[PDB]
Amino acid sequence: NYPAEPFRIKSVETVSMIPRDERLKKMQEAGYNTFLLNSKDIYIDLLTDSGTNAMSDKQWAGMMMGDEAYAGSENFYHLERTVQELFGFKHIVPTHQGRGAENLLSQLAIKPGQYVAGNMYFTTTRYHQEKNGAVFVDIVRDEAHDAGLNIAFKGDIDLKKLQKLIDEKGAENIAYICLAVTVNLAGGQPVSMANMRAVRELTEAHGIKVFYDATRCVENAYFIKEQEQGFENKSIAEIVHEMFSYADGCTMSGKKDCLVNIGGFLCMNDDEMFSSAKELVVVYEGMPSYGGLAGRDMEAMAIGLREAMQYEYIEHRVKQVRYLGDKLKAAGVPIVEPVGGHAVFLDARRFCEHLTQDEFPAQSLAASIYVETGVRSMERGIISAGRNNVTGEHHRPKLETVRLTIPRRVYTYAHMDVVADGIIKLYQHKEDIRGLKFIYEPKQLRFFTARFDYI
Amino acid sequence: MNYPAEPFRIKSVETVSMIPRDERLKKMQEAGYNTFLLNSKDIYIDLLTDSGTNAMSDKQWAGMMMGDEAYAGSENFYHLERTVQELFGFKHIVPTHQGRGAENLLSQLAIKPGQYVAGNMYFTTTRYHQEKNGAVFVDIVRDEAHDAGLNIAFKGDIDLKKLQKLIDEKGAENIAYICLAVTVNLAGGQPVSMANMRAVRELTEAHGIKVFYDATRCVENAYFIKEQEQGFENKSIAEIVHEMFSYADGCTMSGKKDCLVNIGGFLCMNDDEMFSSAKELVVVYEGMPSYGGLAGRDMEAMAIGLREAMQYEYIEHRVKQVRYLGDKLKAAGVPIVEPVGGHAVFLDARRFCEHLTQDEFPAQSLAASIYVETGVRSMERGIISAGRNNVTGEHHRPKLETVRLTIPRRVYTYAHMDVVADGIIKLYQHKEDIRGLKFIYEPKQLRFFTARFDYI
Amino acid sequence: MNYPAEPFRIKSVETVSMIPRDERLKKMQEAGYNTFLLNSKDIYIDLLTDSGTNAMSDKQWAGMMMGDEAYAGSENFYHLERTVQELFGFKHIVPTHQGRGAENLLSQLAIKPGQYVAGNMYFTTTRYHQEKNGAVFVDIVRDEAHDAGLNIAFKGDIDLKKLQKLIDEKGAENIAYICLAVTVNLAGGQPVSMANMRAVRELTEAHGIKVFYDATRCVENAYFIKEQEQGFENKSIAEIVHEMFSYADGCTMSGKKDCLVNIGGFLCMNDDEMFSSAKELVVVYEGMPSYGGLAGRDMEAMAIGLREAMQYEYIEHRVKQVRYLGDKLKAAGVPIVEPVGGHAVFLDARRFCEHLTQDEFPAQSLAASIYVETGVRSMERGIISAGRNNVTGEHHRPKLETVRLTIPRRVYTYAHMDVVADGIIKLYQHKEDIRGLKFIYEPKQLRFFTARFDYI
Amino acid sequence: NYPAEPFRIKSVETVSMIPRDERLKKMQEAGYNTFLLNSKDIYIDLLTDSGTNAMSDKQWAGMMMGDEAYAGSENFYHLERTVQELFGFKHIVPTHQGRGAENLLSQLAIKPGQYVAGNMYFTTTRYHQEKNGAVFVDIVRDEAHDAGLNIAFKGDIDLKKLQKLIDEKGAENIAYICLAVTVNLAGGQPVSMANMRAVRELTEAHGIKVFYDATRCVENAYFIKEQEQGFENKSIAEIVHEMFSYADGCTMSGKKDCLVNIGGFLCMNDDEMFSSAKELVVVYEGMPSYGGLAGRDMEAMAIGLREAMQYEYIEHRVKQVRYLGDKLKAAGVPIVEPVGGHAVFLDARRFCEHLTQDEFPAQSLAASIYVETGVRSMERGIISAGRNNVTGEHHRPKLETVRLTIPRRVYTYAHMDVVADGIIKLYQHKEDIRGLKFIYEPKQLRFFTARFDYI
Ligand SMILES: CC1=C(O)/C(=C\N=C(/C)C(=O)O)C(COP(=O)(O)O)=CN1
Ligand SMILES: CC1=C(O)/C(=C\N=C(/C)C(=O)O)C(COP(=O)(O)O)=CN1
Ligand SMILES: CC1=C(O)/C(=C\N=C(/C)C(=O)O)C(COP(=O)(O)O)=CN1
């Protein structure tokens, strides 16, 4: 049901343990915007699972063995061998993290005016597509947009929407299909092997390329192992390798499922594209053999990807997130369902139904959570959606959420209990949560530095 | 309140795994049914000891990169020295590689052949160093410390009536010193009260008798005082620690326990002449007074760790994590030493195995069976550890025949505790399957470390 | 005086070794005669670049254990931020993963298509980011910087007459900014004087033109100012650095050079609106303004390293070690760029190989031959690096056709320098054996990194 | 002649660089006793080569992999395998450093009244022999006592003295022969393979055991490679293994030739002695599988011993010391000859022949060296010999020396030049060096804390 950690603690990170009254002052000093809190003031930091993971003793040994050569580092060759074996692409180019790989892919693979279709999108990924002249098309199944619908493989592409696009626009006018595993925007929802194969088969008949956004591909493979018929005798490694067999390449943020603090990479099978990629990596990142990483980080990521293949590790990772979601759900706390691989999203609209979206319930709930528990969470609602700059109106998103994002191997079920118990107690007196109003709003990136006060 | 979450985050991890029961069976036999003789790789959760098995912090690992390895004058020595002077309040410090190295120095320096050393229950290496330097050991702990099931507070306390009697019957000049350990390891990690430390100092001082503390789990002990002794609820852990040592003439310390390191110890004293003599001796056994058989980076880690240990939330969690395991075991009717102590839960082997005699080594055997059935390693703390009476040659016979589930600091979670509890509860369902043991190889001293047995 | 000993001790080592000439020959062919394409394992002493190849200190490694990996609000970000604010004197900082990431931001933010960017000699990635954002590059370095053998001080200085002419012929509003690099890498690591920085600021300020520094080797540059510019002999390295940047509106920095790290860079500016815009852009390419595509531990290492770099003895030794190699080479009549610069000795390939034309790529070829004969890796810094004229499609033709023996900071000793000098002197004895090269594979930009050749 | 370092620098240790005037104050604050200087005030620290070595990147990787189990650590098994392969003993017991191993050996191998004979002695080694009731007998060749005699293998035992001892005392009355490699007291002098075999053969015929003090056995093996006929096609590893084939066991300080900062061990071939050793290690050190070391240090020492077998490494180590001695000798500076493996010893008696031994020329020369260069060196003369406590007279040693002891892989030839140039300049005006007199003298260990002032 919930397994014990399949690891023990080698070293600890010291935290302050400041009490509620002091947390309230820190929160006020941050203008009630959790993005403005200092890391040294936070007990449990669930802002993101990106780059916040705990490394192993074996990775730290690798950290001492950084061959820092500008070209031809042994660590690059270790990374390259590892990704070829595990993902099964012919070619790999390291990048400092995922968005560096996305910049490269989109410049290489898009002609202005072409469509890129995907199972929803991530903000950086879609931006790089659009900056290169692509029009984005959502081809996710309709269910993915229903946040209360508890169904499996909610990240699946709708083959009919793909077909429709090909019929209406023409294959030559589609740059590529961008299939993300898992689907972050839908709450971390997995994609099935059947769907990946069906997309490979249809695109292949039309000469259309498919590139994966692989950042949480290991969480994805765990869902396939757990829930997809016929994958129960298959190892995580076998699943991961089969998944990528249905792609022409990928962009990877190692900062997620490769269990590192920095690192990413671009893969492809096509020799000519690989050649062009090497011509471009040097402009933005570094050499084809470091790509904006220290040798020690290529080493840490090579070791971390291989650790991520262990079944017990990934089972525990996903079930720890599930434990938090299960406990919240059992107390009647409204969440996005089903719980995804990396986070639990509170539905702040329903949590704070005495407040209007214009009063920023997700922002305000995230502040309350920090004050009551020392937990930092991310606003993923009206604030982070930003303001229409043509009209000056808020972009008003359907999802008004607080993201409890879980770094890998950092926290225990007891820290999950701190988070849950705190949220449950807040829920019991939810009507007491107050609305927020801007007191400082920057013109851009407002979620990063906006300051608020209570209404 | 009852069970707080870890007051830290995980910075790095070590993988854990379990070999099949069939393989464990083979390994237990190959180790001659002594858990000390199993290999680390063959252990799933290793509760052999809290000694040297602690997880260090990121700050201690940063100190590890700043090892100043000079033979004399290292910054890491000065940092250790001023930290221990500040926190414990003794005048002088001599580092040693670990606690038994400091006990070697103390016993050689402070005992004349034929004298008595009186202590709140024996300890294994401690008693051996006393006895090998010609002392007779006298246990002056309260009787109640030897009754496993008796739930009373401050079980580690010295019985003043027994101390008084020793002085009367033997004369103060024939007592080398009082050895006061905090907490008391073999009583189950049981604390000593401040009132008792103060009373002991007062009695011994009037008679000119020296008192040397075994400081190895003094922070755990300070936690119990803050939690349970009336008047201390408001004092900081650090204030408690400093007051505790104000009632002593010096101490031995294994830093491998409450200083949160993997190696390290020291000897403290207030007396200038003893300091001089201790330095002459340290060079023979350990190294120059300026490193004491430690790398500079380990002095640094030990200085940093001892100060980390003073954080209330850290030590509250440390002790309550142990308590949680004991609570779950108790709830299922598993017999344990009570109350639960600072560093371990001690299964009561006499009750766990009523069908065996103490001469059939129930504790040694239970530890074997726990490993075979669960892949958890635990330690014998009974008749084998007690050693032999150095006059009659018979086994010492402790009332406490226990198996120790010892918890390294900052290493495991409550989920690991639940795994351990579950496996022990299961084994209890068939306790009568645990077989008697007999010696096949017996070392001449500290026999428990490497002795080998076979089933009767 | 002339050649000081290392002002540090060795804390840890990496082994070095040499594969036979026969094996090196094979490897050079397999790398298509481009030194960039050899493997690290196959190199004995690796002088390809001083970029990212530096040895960190014990203090920086201690900072590496204290990485605060938070996505926003990391202590390591705050430490970097206040360090750069203190030492460089700019209002705002945006970290980037390395220097070309900061050049991406600057060029996008500060250039309107069709504008001119004027600089003290081009640099490779710098010129590409200017040109790809629609700028025309204009070289305003003094003519003497392009003559390898001419031994004059402060060769990096901007020719004010050329700057003045640019403003006259093109109009100030059509100049996006002046790019002033310290030191000037491709001139041979040549410094810029304070007087010149002050004069440039004065001229540009009167016309409303912005000046952005390439800060990557500013500490080396400050060393030359202290050593050679009248009036500065008494100022600290840190004072020199802070004054230098007071003449700028912001900078790009590759921390991989003078900040003594293996990864890292940043963009600084004084202007609030530019800061806002830079943050919008950083999120697209690098990461959140609060880490900029760097682990927290690398921000920390870069903060610590930049402050280490201000120690006079450290930078005096850094530069004199380079000078020693150049001195030994000169003494034996080997043709080099003079005076020797801050980070490398640059062999003059035109003189080393008089028998070849620049169209036959003497520098690329010499670098190949050095590796084959010595197992030392060096870099082409000539016509291949210069790239193509983005209007005519012809090779840019630099007067400076050089091969760079680039010295990573705190990595090698004088004995390694002597090994390098000895091997190069030997190769010089048969310079006429070095054969012309021709392209077999040419990338569309920054071609030198991965191009492959074959002998004519 | 002098090779370049067969390594490059991975990381540096920061030092203060304080100037001459400030060094003079530090020296005065230390009462002119270099033992009292703070490490943070010293540029180049030549006090000892014990435990001061620079580790490699590979050792630091091993430092991150410490299996800290109290019993059965993987690191112990790695150490054990390595020592068995390289030294060729059947059994190994780890100890925290060399004197811990000596305590164990002497308790195991000596009955009160027995003789232990050796090629000179080391202070801790001889003390442990004597505390256990042994009488020490020097059986080194007479030449070893002539400090100006430049001959090879000066550490050799005189077989005739050994024979004489057996004849006069009886084999049953000799506990063992303690053969040290190299011989520290004679200036770091090596012992020949011929001598080790001859001693093995004579002792074997009489049933007498031989235990090596192996602390600088790798320096020793380098001398055999370099100078002993017939060892020129032999690897350092082959030499080391043959050396120990002539012993019944050894005590080792890894802090010397195993390239670590802490660590040591005891080896033996005899099963019964191994059993007894395991019974004793637990009293003083720890378990047979950690012996008073952290698991990470058993790992560092296992990796370091194997690194020490590399020919280029040990050739450079010994020749760097030689470089310093050669340069001093060429300027006419009086030194113990020939230069040993680990240090250069200045003859302070001849250096300061205007001073009497009672004026402490070695102590005073060591102070001058620090003041002029920031180099710390060790007094090895009348001060470190101590005072006769029966009579109160100085012990007056024949050797009045300053030891310039070189840690492995820490310094370069340039640092050797700082040391040499400074000493040479002092030598040029040697008559200016002033005598010292006590102002504070402890009753014991006076070299550690005595304070002086100028006469
Ligand atoms: C699905 C997906 C992501 O979730 C993603 C980054 N995620 C962040 C920063 C997060 O907080 O979820 C990126 C960008 O990776 P990067 O943050 O540049 O290494 C790409 N795809
Ligand atoms: C109270 C006390 C101890 O518990 C102790 C060692 N304890 C061990 C090894 C244990 O497992 O409890 C020692 C010896 O310390 P040492 O293991 O040598 O650092 C002294 N006193
Ligand atoms: C003056 C200057 C440089 O020298 C520079 C990079 N130099 C390299 C790679 C070199 O080998 O010189 C860069 C680019 O920095 P980067 O290599 O991207 O961190 C900018 N300016």
Ligand SMILES: CC1=C(O)/C(=C\N=C(/C)C(=O)O)C(COP(=O)(O)O)=CN1
């Ligand atoms: C020949 C020899 C030595 O040189 C030695 C220690 N030497 C020191 C401390 C030195 O400064 O030379 C020891 C003692 O090793 P230890 O310092 O306890 O690891 C034994 N034999």
Ligand SMILES: [K+]
């Ligand atoms: K990070």
Ligand SMILES: [K+]
């Ligand atoms: K690097």
Ligand SMILES: [K+]
């Ligand atoms: K040391």
Ligand SMILES: [K+]
């Ligand atoms: K340990």
